[PDB]
Amino acid sequence: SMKKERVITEFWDGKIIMVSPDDPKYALKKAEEVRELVDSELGFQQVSLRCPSQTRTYMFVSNEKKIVGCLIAEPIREAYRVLAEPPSLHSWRCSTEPEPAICGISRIWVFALMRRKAIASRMVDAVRSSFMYGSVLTTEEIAFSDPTPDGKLFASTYCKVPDFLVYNFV
Ligand SMILES: CC(C)(COP(=O)(O)OP(=O)(O)OC[C@H]1O[C@@H](n2cnc3c(N)ncnc32)[C@H](O)[C@@H]1OP(=O)(O)O)[C@@H](O)C(=O)NCCC(=O)NCCS
């Protein structure tokens, strides 16, 4: 059963594919499982995001055909600069004025033992290149959803600033 998947970029140590919702079920089945694998690690139960028709899921596949990286993009329209949280004298915040964003990084995850290998970086590249046809997104037109500390350490370096855009906060 040789069935053709969608490559965004090929690398010497893997490739980044993408599963759109209007894809063959063989792709959706795999895409759904690696979601569940991520969400359990990130510690989520029944997410159910909005606009399910336009939510693209990226996967970094190693040379041994193992999904070592996953990223789930979704369309947004405005986001906010992350801010450092004021300390509490007696033992994260976000701006209130929004800026226009185009792509939201819902969840991103790299296999633990394969981290610090630019897998996350290359998947976020793939989104910039291939999220909207015939257009490359900027470091400032992407936003991350409720980033964890690791995530915050990642976006600060990737976006080249400390006040990178984030969304879906409370
Ligand atoms: C741990 C994690 C960084 C793994 O992804 P990754 O493949 O290592 O991401 P990258 O290698 O492309 O990191 C890009 C740069 O950002 C910095 N950086 C990334 N992760 C960092 C971390 N945990 N600690 C310190 N700096 C980090 C580094 O400068 C890194 O480049 P460098 O190693 O040459 O210094 C993170 O992306 C991840 O997947 N965590 C698991 C759960 C999670 O994602 N939480 C946050 C969701 S928003």
Residue numbers in the entry: 521 to 611, 623 to 701
Question: Which sentences from the paper describe this structure?
Answer:
Cohesin is loaded onto chromatin by the Scc2-Scc4 loader complex, however persistent cohesion cannot be established without the acetylation of two conserved tandem lysines on the Smc3 subunit by the Eco1 acetyltransferase (ACT). Eco1 is an acetyltransferase that belongs to the Gcn5-related N-acetyltransferase (GNAT) family. The xEco2 ACT fold is divided into two domains: the N-terminal domain contains α helix 1 and 2, and β strand 1–5 with a conserved central β hairpin insertion between β4 and β5 that is unique to cohesin ACTs; the C-terminal domain contains α helix 3, and β strand 6 and 7. The binding site for CoA is sandwiched between the N- and C-terminal domains involving β5 and α3, while the substrate peptides binds mainly to the central β hairpin and the C-terminal domain including the conserved C-terminal extension (C extension).
Crystals of the peptide-free xEco2 (henceforth xEco2) diffracted to 3.0 Å, whereas the binding of the K105-CoA and K106-CoA peptides to xEco2 improved the resolution to 2.4 and 1.9 Å respectively. In the peptide-free xEco2 structure, the conserved W623 occupying the hydrophobic pocket is partially stacked against the conserved F700 on the C extension. However, this mode of dimerization was not observed in either our peptide-free or substrate-bound crystal forms. The peptide-free and K105-CoA structures were solved using the K106-CoA structure as a start model in Phaser and multiple rounds of re-building and refinement were carried out as described.
